[PDB]
Amino acid sequence: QSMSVGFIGAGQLAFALAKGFTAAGVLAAHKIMASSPDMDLATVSALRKMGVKLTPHNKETVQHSDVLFLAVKPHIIPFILDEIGADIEDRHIVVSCAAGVTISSIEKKLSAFRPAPRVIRCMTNTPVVVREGATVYATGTHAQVEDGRLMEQLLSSVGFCTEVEEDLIDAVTGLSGSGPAYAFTALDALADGGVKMGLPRRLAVRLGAQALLGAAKMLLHSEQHPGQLKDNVSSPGGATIHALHVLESGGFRSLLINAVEASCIRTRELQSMAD
Amino acid sequence: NLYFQSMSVGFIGAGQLAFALAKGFTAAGVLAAHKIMASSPDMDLATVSALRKMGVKLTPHNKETVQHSDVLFLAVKPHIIPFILDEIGADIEDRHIVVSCAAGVTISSIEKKLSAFRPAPRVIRCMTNTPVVVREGATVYATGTHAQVEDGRLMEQLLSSVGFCTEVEEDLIDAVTGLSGSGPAYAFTALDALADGGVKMGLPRRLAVRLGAQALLGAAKMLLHSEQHPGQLKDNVSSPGGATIHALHVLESGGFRSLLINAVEASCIRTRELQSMAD
Amino acid sequence: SMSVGFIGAGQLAFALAKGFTAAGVLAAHKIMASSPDMDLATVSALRKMGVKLTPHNKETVQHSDVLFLAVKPHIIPFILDEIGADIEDRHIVVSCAAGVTISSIEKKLSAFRPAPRVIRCMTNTPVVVREGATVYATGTHAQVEDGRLMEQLLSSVGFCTEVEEDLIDAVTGLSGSGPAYAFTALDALADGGVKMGLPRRLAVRLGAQALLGAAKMLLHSEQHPGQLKDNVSSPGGATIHALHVLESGGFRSLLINAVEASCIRTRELQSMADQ
Amino acid sequence: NLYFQSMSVGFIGAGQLAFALAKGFTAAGVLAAHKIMASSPDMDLATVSALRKMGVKLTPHNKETVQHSDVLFLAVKPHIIPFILDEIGADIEDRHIVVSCAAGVTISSIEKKLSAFRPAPRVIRCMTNTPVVVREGATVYATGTHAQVEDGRLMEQLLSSVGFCTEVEEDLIDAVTGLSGSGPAYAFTALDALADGGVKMGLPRRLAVRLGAQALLGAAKMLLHSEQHPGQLKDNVSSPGGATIHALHVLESGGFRSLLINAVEASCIRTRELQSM
Secondary structure (H helix, E strand, C coil), X not given: CCCCEEEECCCHHXXXXXXXXXXXXCCCXXXXXXXXXXXXXXXXXXXHHHCCEEECCHHHHHHHCCEEEXXXXXXXXXXXXXXXXXXXXXXXXXXXXXXXXXXXXXXXHHHCCCCCCEEEEEECCHHHHHCCEEEEEEEXXXXXXXXXXXXXXXXXXXXXXXXXXXXXXXXXXXXXXXXXXHXXXXXXXXXXXXXXXXXXXXXXXHHHHHHHHHHXXXXXXXXXXXXXXXXXXXXXXXXXXXXXXXXXXXXXXXXXXXXXXXXXXXXXHHHHHHC | CCCCCCCCEEEECCCHHHHHHHHHHHXXXXXXXXXXXXXXXXXXXXXXXXXXXXXXXXXXXXXXXXXXXXXXXXXXXXXXXXXXXXXXXXXXXXXXXXXXXXXXXXXXXXHHHHHCCCCCCEEEEEEXXXXXXXXCEEEEEEECCCCCHHHHHHHHHHHHCCEEEEECCHHHHHHHHHHHHCHHXXXXXXXXXXXXXXXXXXXXXXXXXXXXXXXXXXXXXXXXXXXXXXXXXXXXXXXXXXXXXXXXXXXXXXXXXXXXXXXXXXXXXXHHHHHHHHC | CCCEEEECCCHHHHHHHHHHHHHCCCCHHHEEEECCCCCCHHHHHHHHHCCEEECCHHHHHHHCCEEEECCCHHHHHHHHHHHHHHCCCCCEEEECCCCCCHHHHHHHHHCCCCCCEEEEEECCHHHHHCCEEEEEEECCCCCHHHHHHHHHHHHCCEEEEXXXXXXXXXXXHHHHCHHHHHHHXXXXXXXXXXXXXXXXXXXXXXXXXXXXXXXXXXXXCCCCHHHXXXXXXXXXXXXXXXXXXXXXXXXXXXXXXXXXHHHHHHHHHHHHHHC | CCCCCCCCEEEECCCHHHHHXXXXXXXXXCCCHHHEEEECCCCCCHHHHHHHHHCCEEECCHHHHXXXXXXXXXXXXXXXXXXXXXXXXXXXXXXXXXXXXXXXXXXXXXXXXXXXXXXXXXXXXXXXXXXXXXXXXXXXXXXXXXXXXXXXXXXXXXXXXXXXXXXXXXXXXXXXXXXXXXXXXXXXXXXXXXXXXXXXXXXXXXXXXXXXXXXXXXXXXXXXXXXCCXXXXXXXXXXXXXXXXXXXXXXXXXXXXXXXXHHHHHHHHHXXXXXXX
16 A cells, blocks of 8 residues: 555544554554644644654645545634645545535635545544444545545444445434443443442443443344343343333433434534534 | 363253353354253243254253253253252262352352252352353352362353453452343443434434444443543543533433443342342 | 732732732732722722722723723723723733623724733632632733733732633633532532531531542542542442432533533623624 | 651551552651551552552551551451451550541440450541542541540641541541542542533633632632631622523522532431441
């Protein structure tokens, strides 16, 4: 491959993807360049230790890169496209990770400079850092068929990856983009429950995380409905069905629906705030 | 490169957990399916039909499992254990290691029943869970009065082939039941609901299930591979004013954390009840 | 060396003057404060302190180099109209009013004389015990030394850091209103101590000491607040039982609600002032 | 300071509280780290590693801590205390002051166990909290039957070096546990949540944590230095129609005050249950 990768933005997601790509062996750390207006972030220091090249100049990242990731906050994307739009070349694939930012808005900015910018919109999540990410992407107007395939090969090296229509990406954000945070909240609470019932905290954290990992893997490897797996686990009169009742009495299911909806709706607002 | 060439495993009970451990052990390559035997009173079970395809030896007679086996897993409902122990108690020999997976059933109660037939039965109490079927179980065990040090080491070696395994004091097992024993059910409920949320916002059901499960798997792996607090990892997900912190607020407003604490507590308390009603 | 003035002589002017002089960075006799209602108890305490007082806002301006506007937000435009013609090149105008934008201040003052030097700050009442929380944003024409001087002055009475102005309304919801959340919490904790048999005086002292020590622990630790929570809760113990009942009431969400409500009200008030 | 001239201190237990006290005692300068000895069944704990760095002498044998100590802190979970008092009870001498930090454990229960060995054991019961590590603890103590007058004074001076300290009647200690014993955890929970609120409204997490902690620290110091009621200080903060009074309304609508009362009560009641074990 010998592909050169750039990140405009050096935050948590740029660090997670760089760490994933290098652990996967797809990219040498020193073939990645990242830029940031704030060179004093801790994520910048971890990238530096990894061997990723760092610069304060977004133009240098663009000129270095073959595949260019836009890993900045959604409201910063239009100022970035103005700043380095003249430096995007025909050889570039521009991959936007910003939540809610549409392919159309990016192409409208970039097309004022060169006529056929190759744009891909991505929604991924922090577990790419352990090569278990969940990624979807949509291809832009001028993205070649080989561009989508390259993107899927690259993002599949750090987790699940699949092409979607762009109009699903805001909902994906609410589910798997924000999802790891729902899981971290759940794991902290489950550990608190283990401690309340007499477990040492260290063991309770380990057991809860292992339970959630195992259950998620069971579901991915099963063709059965999660309600069926739940039924298979709950013996009559037993401990599990008693616990499931108290979850139901609190509306546990509805809270998770509320969360996916709230994150999706906010993502749609971030873009309406832009346009 | 682990393999127990001199170990014959038996399962009394052939339900979900017996199938899960047998499938995990065989997938791990540490046991050949033909060196495993399972017994059940209901030989028309879907799990019995599956064990047969793996190559596991099947019999309706619990005494046959006992005579075939060195390591004997009791994988039956907790109220069935006293009748099982009466049935096969006279068939327990010096070579047997009895491993009870029955929730709540104490080492003391098993040893009392078996000791009426022959002194010094070797007993280990286990709490495991169904993801051993994909070799990602969470298992704890406690050793009985007459279990040798080598017995716990062997059982940890075997149960570590299908997931996490550690020794604990017996008085922690009811709490473990509430956390990692019942935990997969909490996760299945959460994943159904997360998929409903994805569908509400316009995703196809199949994709919503896949993405939700991948999100949960990835987050759990992140935490297991990190020394950071789960609150610090959560903080790293949520950018200021963004989508995730908005969703976290609505979880908090419904007392999401407290529901999970309530669940661990309720499963643990019910486990203590089942045992106390046993005695 | 420096001459500080206060337009307004209420709770905030007293807290800042008490803090500054307790810190030894200003002499009380080098400070002037003005007030329309010279009968306020805060005006009497400033006089007992040694601060020079006056009812004429214009006298404060002529005396001062650094000029704090410590009036209510709705009074700021009237102040700027009354003294705008007296602002000289030497003045640094520091607005402490919630919500009021640098833009709106510069617009009024610029009609009189170009390049007014303006700082916007958000502080809180614990500056009176030199443990305030202060952020500030520099205006269009504030020199670099203006911000450094302001941070040096306000660091003597607590934490102080520069921020972009668009964060200040959120800071108001967190540390501006935060003391009030803590006073409410301390009253309730004391009620709980009293319910369980403690004398009120002891319950107030113990609750306040607990909150002070925990806050200092967090400020002195590199660890996440959830980690310190974990370190404190022994398995099956009293603390994890109490944390469960907080969680069951949605304790965390109420504090999120509060920060949000204060921030939103601050934005609301400014939107009424601009229109 | 002649109390601490030649004083040796021992910890039976090396968890979070033993480290916090040893760190606070040494930071205050009241005792040299080498004059402190700790014992733990598991040298694999994280706090046992930190105590070793400080220069605190370690050992696995509680008998070694007893022989070394003049003042002996019992910093173990409440259900292990009877096994500890059986183990080293024969080694408690008239020279020892035994200070129990285990929650709910009554002076009577300790004196009953130790009086079977020698007749006049000097026992003090203590409820302190983890901020002694930054010398801002909240400590109460009650003196036992045979504690001399100088024992209480010695206790007050030692624990005053790491924060607030006062003597109480023992029947108040369960309630103190619910308030200042568990209180730091309530504050850590509140600070996490306040920071989430800051983040929701656009602040970087690092800044939101710093501002929220500073607000809490400053408000607590204000109240400690004021003669005014917390409600009057609250009233001073809230301008008419303003941001703060709007936020206070949403706290009230969720019963914020009742949750903190519920917490103090739940921790106190659990402590009473443990005391019945």
